[PDB]
């Protein structure tokens, strides 16, 4: 089989998503060596225009008043088999939800939307910053989905399904996810995972129940993602020891 073709597309992002990918260290070099060709990434390489990609890792949101940005995100959908919203800005808007214009030297750059409001998104990788391990798992599994035996492609499709469901669920992320869709649904069981995942310490547990500092929350969508009562896909997660060994072998020298 061939290596799949992967691009990193940079919209209104901070490059922390790219840094997260790079923080797989020799893992990334192993993937680039054996499974994937980086065909486009302005930060790392000199390909100036968006080429065709099997997988586009798209970070950042879209500024509606920046013509080239709107064209880039449409061109990306047109050029890509699989579009991945990489990180919470691409998935959910994140800190650019708060953008409201008025700053030099483009006071009209006022409106930012997650990429899923402008194009169809196949896969979400939520997180701010996203976990290096997640970006790696998704790249490996995308390779298996495209180049593996049908036993692998079956595993890969089952692994990615909840990240594809997230992309179909919507383009909003907030502390309030845990109210709306977990506590208010009768699904919260007080494990406290949301509090560990929150990057800004906006979540405490009081008598076993989430308490959200909404004016600290930066709307990244991490806590609903990590909650074991958002998606819990038993067919994958109960096979954790096996899937771990499979991923590890794919990275071994």
């Amino acid at each position: 089989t061939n290596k799949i073709k992967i691009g990193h597309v940079h919209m209104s992002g901070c490059t922390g998503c790219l840094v997260s990918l790079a923080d797989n260290n020799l893992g990334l070099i192993k993937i680039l060596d054996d499974y994937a060709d980086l065909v486009y990434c302005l930060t790392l390489a000199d390909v100036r225009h968006i080429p065709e990609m099997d997988v586009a890792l798209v970070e950042g949101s879209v500024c509606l008043q920046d013509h080239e940005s709107v064209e880039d995100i449409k061109e990306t959908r047109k050029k890509s088999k699989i579009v991945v919203a990489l990180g919470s800005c691409a998935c959910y808007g994140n800190i650019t939800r708060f953008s409201r214009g008025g700053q030099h030297n483009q006071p009209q750059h006022e409106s930012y939307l997650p990429i899923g409001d402008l194009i169809d998104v196949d896969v979400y990788i939520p997180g701010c910053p996203p976990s290096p391990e997640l970006i790696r798992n998704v790249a490996v599994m995308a390779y298996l989905l495209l180049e593996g035996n049908e036993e692998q492609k079956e595993l890969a499709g089952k692994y990615l399904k909840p990240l594809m469901d997230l992309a179909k669920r919507g383009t909003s992320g907030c502390f309030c996810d845990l109210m709306y869709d977990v506590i208010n649904q009768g699904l919260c069981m007080g494990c406290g995972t949301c509090a560990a995942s929150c990057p800004v310490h906006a979540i405490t547990l009081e008598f076993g129940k989430p308490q959200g500092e909404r004016d600290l929350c930066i709307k990244c969508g991490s806590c609903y993602g990590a909650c074991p009562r958002s998606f819990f896909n038993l067919d994958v997660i109960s096979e954790f020891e096996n899937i771990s060994e499979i991923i590890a072998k794919a990275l071994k020298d």
């Binding site: 509606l64 008043q65 214009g101 008025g102 006071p107 009209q108 006022e110 409001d117």
Partner: protein
Amino acid sequence: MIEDPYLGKYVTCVSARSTDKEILKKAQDGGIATALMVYALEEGFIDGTIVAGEGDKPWQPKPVVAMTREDILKARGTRYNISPQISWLKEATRSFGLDKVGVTGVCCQMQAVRKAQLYPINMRDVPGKVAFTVGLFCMENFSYKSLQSIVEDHANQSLGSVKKMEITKGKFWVYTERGNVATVPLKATHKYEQPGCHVCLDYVSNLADISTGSVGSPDGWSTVFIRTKVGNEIWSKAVADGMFETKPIEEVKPGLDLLRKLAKQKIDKNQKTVEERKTFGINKGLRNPYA
């Protein structure tokens, strides 16, 4: 009742200016917006009104509930950046204890009031206490940073020296207190406009009781539309009381011909924008508040 497709619904249109020489000293145009609110207060049609007062930075407006002739006059002259007039609409009926609220503002602010009157959403007591609205013509507005950039850079003027600003004859004009004049081609200002103005389908404040503006009238005069029964009662009385000089608009150049054409260009350009929102993405579009 004329029902014009670009100038909205109205009973008459005249060219007018206030007979109050104190008001005219600092009015942008004819002094219609100030004269109508002062008169409404002294006659008791209103007991207070929302006007764009002076704010904390030069040429930045601050909405305020004015309840005296003196406080109304402080709001004279056009501030070409955003003044959130409607933020005091409910409060005017609470701690201010008003029974008859006046509102001044531009076309979208007139729309906000009428929406509040028909669909009050946590706007208790507002439908029945709105007593009088005067709407300004408005082609587009700017953030304060936009206005600073235009005046300080493009016109090379200090904001603290500016006496009047005026968009007319294709140029953004700056008049200083010491007597100088600077202009900027409107083409240079386009990047700075507030983006939400680009879906606006209303030029001459279609939904106000009385609408007033500059285009169609010579300098020092205003083009005025009298639209609603409220608007007609107050205007008739005010004219009868000596408050205004008038001229039928069709005896005035350039008059309603130019005005109806500028209204048409605004609506057509912004209706196109509204249309392009629908297919803005790939197999996806942006929201249309008018849908």
